[PDB]
Amino acid sequence: AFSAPAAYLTHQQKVLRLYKRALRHLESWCVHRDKYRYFACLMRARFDEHKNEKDMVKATQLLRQAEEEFWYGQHPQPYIFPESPGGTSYERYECYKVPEWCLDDWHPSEKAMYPDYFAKREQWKRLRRESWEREVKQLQEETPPGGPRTEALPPARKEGDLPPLWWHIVTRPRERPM
Amino acid sequence: YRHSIFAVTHVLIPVWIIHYYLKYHVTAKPYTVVERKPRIFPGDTILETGEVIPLMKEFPDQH
Amino acid sequence: VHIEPRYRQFPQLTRSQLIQAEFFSATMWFWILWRFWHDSDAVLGHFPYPDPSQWTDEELGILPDDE
């Protein structure tokens, strides 16, 4: 989620993703650790047996057949980590995530209840407001005339600068906000 | 102390209020509180009229 | 009570929970045995099941075929 996607997935990426999916579904089928280790070793033996293949057409055909085999033999109810998409704990804490722009609508009494925090918050706000022009200038200098070709952002070249478009990434709510 | 102060208010005041409401307002109107009549068995004593409900026949022994 | 987490090791148990679990399992089995000793009829039946084939035509009121 933190990395900009590419235009397409290469053959190596396709086969690696298929290998990971097959291992995860095999672990779902093979509940016990020793049995899972045995069959995962067999699966990697198959992958290594097909590893060396100069013919890309034959490699693609093998990949297609392997994908068909995986879809036929997949676990109907595969194991999913609780926080992963589709998991039992996915998006559970999204209702507790409140942003700093909500935080600056507080009453003066509430703000006075937390004196030291808001001084640092004001420092952060000044730091944000003193860098936006440099960030936009750096972004517009490094773009091609046609426009961006990828969703990757440049870092900060100078010592006193900050990586452009950093505010929300840095100040995103914690994974357990409450 | 906490359980005593919780038991007087939360239990003793509602029961007083409800008993007062039932005994003098709900039961002041007909048919508001209807009780299924008690079961009368043979060989019993009706307390209201001082009556005696007699026993049944002599059971034929079944072993 | 404070329980320190363990890494790749069997967790730290407690004498109180051990004895309570054993006591309640023993209580369940004792109750089952005590009830079966006194109320075995509730599981094994109480009255015999009659065999219809052993009933006589005289007591069932079935006349001979000639009538």
Binding site: - | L12, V15, W16, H19, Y20, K23, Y24, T27, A28, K29, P30, Y31, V34, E35, R36, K37, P38, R39, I40, F41, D44, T45, I46, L47, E48, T49, E51, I53 | -
Partner: protein
């Protein structure tokens, strides 16, 4: 309290069997009843005594309004608005009284069923017949007259029913 008419709201005599214990164990129900009498019944009785003493200090009365009888829509002439108005008001009051009579009979039936309990299908069959008669008469009188019912519409329905009955009687004994 018993500030209602026993004849209007009948109730069979209450037969409570006497307690005849066959065991030496104490009765938790009896002990809890004693506790309830000591803790609740006596304080509420004292409070009610005080309140009723305060009520008797100044005692005043209210009356039941009596309505005179007026000529009805049968005696009213056609297009006689005053007589029609009086007859309509009288008919509406009678309609409300009949509704409350039906309510009284239904209350009798419900109370009898609950009281009899497990043997209601036989014991409370006298209330069922009275309710059947009252319901049939009420339906025949104030049947489907609509949302704009009136004394004239009820009179028209009664005339139609009388004509039907007369025709049936004639075709039977003719």
């Amino acid at each position: 309290p018993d500030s209602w008419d026993k004849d209007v709201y009948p109730e069979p005599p209450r037969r409570t069997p006497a307690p005849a214990p066959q065991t030496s164990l104490p009765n938790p129900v009896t002990y809890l009843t004693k506790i309830f009498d000591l803790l609740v019944d006596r304080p509420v009785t004292l409070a009610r005594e005080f309140i009723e003493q305060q009520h008797a200090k100044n005692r005043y009365y209210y009356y039941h309004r009596e309505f005179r009888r007026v000529p009805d829509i049968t005696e009213c002439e056609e297009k006689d608005i005053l007589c029609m108005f009086e007859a309509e008001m009288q008919w509406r009051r009678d309609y409300k009284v009949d509704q409350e009579i039906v309510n009284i009979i239904q209350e009798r039936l419900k109370a009898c069923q609950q009281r009899e309990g497990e043997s209601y299908r036989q014991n409370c069959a006298k209330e069922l017949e009275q309710f059947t008669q009252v319901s049939k008469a009420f339906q025949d009188r104030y049947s489907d007259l609509g949302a704009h019912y009136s004394a004239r519409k009820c009179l028209a329905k009664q005339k139609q029913r009388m004509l039907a009955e007369r025709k049936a009687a004639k075709e039977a004994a003719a």
